[PDB]
UniProtKB/Swiss-Prot annotation:
SUPFAM superfamilies: NosL/MerB-like, Winged helix' DNA-binding domain. This is Alkylmercury lyase. Keywords: Lyase, Mercuric resistance, Mercury, Plasmid. GO terms for molecular function: alkylmercury lyase activity. Its EC number is 4.99.1.2. Belongs to the MerB family. It comes from Escherichia coli. It catalyses: an alkylmercury + H(+) = an alkane + Hg(2+). The gene is merB. The lineage of its organism: Bacteria, Pseudomonadati, Pseudomonadota, Gammaproteobacteria, Enterobacterales. NCBIfam families: lyase_MerB, PRK13239.1. Transmembrane segments: none annotated. Pfam families: HTH_15 (PF12324), MerB (PF03243). HAMAP family: MerB.
């Protein structure tokens, strides 16, 4: 029930990366592909720097023209719907809880329980979650692996569930996952707040 280990490792894997992160998310939030030169202009960075940082992010999604379309927040369909009239998507459940505070917008999030397929939805603002349906919604966490593909090693195991017991039944069948944990969606949101408050201090 102690979540510092997840906060610590998430920052490790994820993280001038932090300097690039927030501006990229806010761009992607406009609903369109982001070029390296647009990104570079926004940051006041030389192009080599932007490229170097992106090269460390192996899960980064690109379109036909090689522009950024996915980086946590994505234009390519996933199980995690992230609506701000735009319909965007997130790589994992925790992403949906973190992004709103970083982009300064409230988001309507929806998905399906990973154990049962039941619909789940909530509204996530920079400071709280609301309209949590179902109320007992849960989230799975694993410990990020430091040098691994973040989307495969972390994001693909970080789901919403209709309930904490339902989530725990599911977790009981999923060994092999490092540091697998079930928390309430409210606890997951608190984790995301901690993550952000730290991340922001790392920024220049
Ligand atoms: Hg993720």
């Amino acid at each position: 029930m102690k979540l510092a280990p997840y906060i610590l490792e998430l920052l490790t894997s994820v993280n001038g990366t932090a300097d690039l992160l927030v501006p990229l998310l806010r761009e992607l939030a406009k609903g369109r592909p982001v070029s390296r030169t647009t990104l570079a202009g926004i940051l006041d960075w030389p192009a080599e720097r932007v490229a170097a940082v992106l090269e460390q992010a192996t899960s980064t999604e690109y379109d036909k023209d090689g522009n950024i379309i996915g980086y946590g927040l994505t234009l390519r369909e996933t199980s995690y719907v992230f609506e701000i009239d735009r319909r965007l998507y997130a790589w994992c459940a925790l992403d949906t809880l973190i992004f709103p505070a970083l982009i300064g917008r409230t988001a309507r999030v929806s998905s399906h329980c990973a154990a049962t397929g039941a619909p789940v939805s909530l509204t996530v603002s920079p400071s709280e979650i609301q309209a949590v349906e179902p109320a007992g919604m849960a989230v799975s966490l694993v410990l990020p692996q430091e040098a691994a593909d973040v989307r495969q090693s972390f994001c693909s195991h970080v789901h919403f569930f209709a309930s904490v017991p339902t989530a725990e039944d599911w977790a009981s069948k999923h060994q092999g996952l490092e540091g697998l944990a079930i928390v309430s969606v409210h606890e997951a949101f608190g984790l995301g707040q901690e993550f952000n408050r730290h991340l922001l201090q790392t920024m220049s």
